[PDB]
Design a protein around this nucleic acid. Structure first.
Ligand SMILES: [Zn+2]
Ligand SMILES: [Zn+2]
Length: 59
DNA sequence: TTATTCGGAAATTAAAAACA
DNA sequence: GTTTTTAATTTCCGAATAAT
């Protein structure tokens, strides 16, 4: 049988450069893509979705 | 050829809602 | 107080364009 492409598990979080490039980060810091690119590997904070927006009843 | 860009599918996730 | 629902948000696939 031929090989099926394993969708890799996602990184716990993506560093700023992997976020900008829309590419695969990892759980090392610096991440592997930043080591290869010789670029600063920085973690930036996530957006927190707001409180106080009703949804209406669930199915 | 490799490097960079990015649209959008798929995955994550957290407040609302539902439940105990 | 648990847990479930499901839309805000994030991750990165993959297919393009740009650079070399
Ligand atoms: Zn990264
Ligand atoms: Zn990085």
């Amino acid at each position: 049988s031929g090989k099926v492409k394993k969708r890799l598990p996602q990184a716990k979080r993506a560093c700023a450069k992997c976020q900008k490039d829309n590419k695969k980060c990892d759980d090392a810091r610096p991440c592997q893509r930043c080591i290869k690119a010789k670029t600063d590997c920085i973690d930036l904070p996530r957006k927190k979705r707001p409180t106080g927006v009703r949804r209406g009843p669930y199915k």
